[model samples]
Target: SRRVDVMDVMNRLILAMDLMNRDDALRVTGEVREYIDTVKIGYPLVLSEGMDIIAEFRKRFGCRIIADFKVADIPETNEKICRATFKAGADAIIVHGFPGADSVRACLNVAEEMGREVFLLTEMSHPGAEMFIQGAADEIARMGVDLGVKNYVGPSTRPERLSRLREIIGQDSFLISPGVGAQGGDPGETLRFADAIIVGASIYLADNPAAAAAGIIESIKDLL
Candidate 1:
């Protein structure tokens, strides 16, 4: 069975194409397309290239695009963002859970209506997340479960937290982790809990992106 239900998303890998320039973003992502069938396009790239970049990635690489919007807004505004993202050809979007169920529900509703998906972002991988997010992460994940969320975004930097999230979401839900590679998360260790890993600068900044991706895939080959 596919780890992530999105079509064409294989190898348990999703490239976080945060590169700001269109040419570099396109070149790096395209180079790794053979190894990654899914790309996570966040605000850094989206804001720089415009929403059409979503369709561009699809047209060029034939890969699934996850709009890493980290959507955080009022219910109505969140709905609008989700609508715009899906219209721009994103296969799925990531929404923050700290905003409460109403905001999360707004995205879920829009995604369901449009036949797309919403992956709830419960915690982050960076250092500052511990300031407030770490304390509330468990509750946020629990809230996602209560809302019937089937897909989630957790962190790979912290295996214990990732495993806890996996335990909270259970085995059936799709959990994708970020913080691999550049963030110092081990690919094999992350795969032990996450269904897929979202990697960024590590591959994007490499002199040969395809080889970087291939190495990562090779490291996790046995896990899959």
Candidate 2:
């Protein structure tokens, strides 16, 4: 089981290395280590490099590694992926909300058994995401909470939606927003409600990832 101090991630940010190269992901994760607490290795990289990269990050940084599979599948398949990811050294995983309750539960059960955590995708960062996730956020939250899913992915780009998600998840659960920086989301505003914000291109695309990450974290220093 992963024994991470949730408090440690409260102020430290999360970096998304999705659709990024293994070499680049390795460099970015290491560079942003000062300001980011977790590295999100999404589907492309995880599938491209395999679970070896999860342990690769764990080996060098010793920080939380989130397998961002956005897992959306049947209960059986979801359980298998969760088990595989946890076994591969992921401290947590990102799961989709489209499949509803039972699917989320299956992943949660695997997470519980593996001593890991699950973050339900209530609202995504992409612009077209409303088409699929809007109406389902409430139901996902309703069922997700009952299943003890304490973390969620909310969009930082839209405060209205972010706040709405906060409402659905309530005050107790933690919200980690995606779309900060490059996606036009401000750190201060995003961090105002979200416990942590996930940034992708903002840091990875910068000439100096460390400085870019530092600036983003500095913007919300007072709030932290």
RMSD of each: 1.6, 2.9
Most lDDT-accurate candidate:
1
Q: Whole-model lDDT, candidate 2?
A: 0.82
Model 2 poorest ten-residue lDDT run: 1-10
lDDT of 1 by residue, 91-197 (tens): 89999998899999999999999999999999899999899888999999999999989899888999899999998988778889999988899888788888889
- CA lDDT of each prediction against the hidden true structure: 0.90, 0.82
**TM-score of each candidate?**
0.96, 0.92
Of the candidates shown, which would achieve the greatest TM-score relative to the real structure? 1
Please estimate how well model 1 matches the true structure, expressed as its whole-model Cα lDDT: 0.90
Q: Could you give candidate 2's per-residue lDDT for residues 1-224 as a string of tens digits?
A: 02254535725588888755788888878887877767878877877887798898889888788888989999999999899889999988999988978899999999988888999988787778878687777777777778888888888888787887777677778778889878898777777678888888888889999999888867888876
